[PDB]
Design a protein around this nucleic acid. Structure first.
Lengths: 159, 159
DNA sequence: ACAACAGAGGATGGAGCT
DNA sequence: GCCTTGCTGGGACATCTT
DNA sequence: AGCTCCATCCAGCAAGGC
DNA sequence: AAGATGTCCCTCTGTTGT
């Protein structure tokens, strides 16, 4: 009955929806790696695994993951990073026994009405705060983009 | 000190491979399990995460087994899909191996080749004569890659 | 049909309607 | 220090030679 | 089965703002 | 310690030859 939603970007998050128990959300653990000249922010695979096993989730729990579909105007590095975080989350989740279901980014706009007009400058961050009043304190800043995303992904899979 | 345990080399591309070097035992290689996924208007092969964790768990390797994975470093001339797929297979492999309890060591593609593309299969064919029958078709360059990455890994000292 | 080769580097997904 | 806009879309790695 | 529209990002690296 | 320079893939869609 558990539902897990994951925003796989380098500043994404993970949402956990245990039945009959209050909701949860976690920032995706990260680290700093040198890439050529400069440092880059990437997902910490080790810390992700320990965060997953700490859930003590039932075997075969469905995890809904946002599909990486960047735009043609985006740079090559954006495409590389997009597939990297997507594949890593898929790999971690499948190896950890979870059942993974990819989902597009436009999916949660179906049940939670949102359009290009009235752009989600903070619409996503506070529609998720509406569906989850317990996590209203975690979504005040604009940097909580990923936390709200993972919450909406999990809510989409729950319904 | 010299590494006495198992060493594993992985070519993370879609048609890559994985080489297993048990100490004083017949060396083995495996074509990376893939499956055909619908994307856009067509179909492309992508790494089968579920079959990969089934292959690695069939090894029953000691936890912390060193796995050397070739880094994905595409060219600027390559298309966005090339960059996306490059990071995807690289992230999925790292995610699977870390979640499976392996110790993952990224190795640049230049490092293991400098230790020893058209000739790579014959270099691995003579180095591993048992698997020479598998390195007859040049499409097995991914197999020779995993071998030479794994052979490079055993020469790297550990702690 | 599968392999080897050649050449350029590329959105994707979903809703709707024929 | 750590957000927040704002904006384009981007090699990375190693070996040399200043 | 097509075949129209029409929607969807994030990465990364600068400057400024709290 | 920085710069100059030269190397390193793969993806994807065709076409061609087994």
């Amino acid at each position: 009955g558990w539902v897990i939603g994951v925003a796989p970007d380098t500043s994404g998050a993970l949402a956990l929806l245990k039945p009959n128990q209050p909701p949860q959300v976690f920032d995706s653990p990260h680290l700093k790696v040198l890439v050529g000249k400069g440092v880059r922010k990437r997902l910490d695979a080790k810390a992700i695994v320990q965060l997953l096993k700490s859930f003590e989730a039932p075997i075969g729990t469905t995890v809904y993951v946002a599909q990486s579909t960047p735009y043609p105007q985006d740079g090559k590095q954006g495409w590389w990073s997009g597939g990297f975080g997507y594949g890593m989350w898929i790999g971690i989740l499948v190896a950890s026994g979870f059942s993974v279901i990819p989902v597009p980014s436009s999916a949660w706009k179906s049940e939670f009405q949102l359009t290009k007009e009235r752009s989600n400058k903070d619409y996503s961050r506070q529609v998720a705060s509406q569906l989850f009043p317990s996590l209203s304190s975690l979504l005040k800043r604009k940097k909580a983009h990923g936390r709200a995303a993972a919450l909406l992904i999990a809510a989409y899979g729950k319904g």
